[PDB]
Amino acid sequence: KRAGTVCSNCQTSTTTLWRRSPMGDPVCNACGLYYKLHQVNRPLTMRKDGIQTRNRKVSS
DNA sequence: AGATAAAC
DNA sequence: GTTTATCT
Ligand SMILES: [Zn+2]
């Protein structure tokens, strides 16, 4: 039940992987990934109503 | 969960 | 070049 777990980095409640930060900040995996890229705070301008999805990667 | 690779 | 979701 992650209803209420608002991503402390982008306020998104729908996430592909709830990255529970050790400090106690539930941040949607997307924030944890891009954060590792530039190591800065993500503006939720790229957020969306439901979890984004596409042609799932074919089983390799 | 974390890692991988894909797709735009 | 760049970013995230689904994969395992
Ligand atoms: Zn987030």
Cβ within 8 Å of residue A49, ≥6 positions away: A14
CATH T-level topology, domain A1-60:
Erythroid Transcription Factor GATA-1; Chain A (3.30.50)
CA of A26 to the centre of ligand 1 (A): 8
In three-state secondary structure terms, A1 is coil
Our measurement of the distance from residue A23's CA atom to the centroid of its chain's CA atoms, rounded to an integer in Å, reads: 16
Experimentally, the structure was elucidated by NMR
Looking from the CA of A50 toward its CB, the CA atoms found within 13 Å total: 2
**First CA to last CA distance, chain A:** 31
Q: Which residues touch strand C (CB under 7 A)?
A: A 15-17, 28-31, 33-34, 37-38, 42, 46, 51-54, 56-57, 59
What residue has token string 């979890």? A51
Please name the residue ranges forming H helices in A1-60. Answer: 29-38
Q: How many residues does chain A have?
A: 60
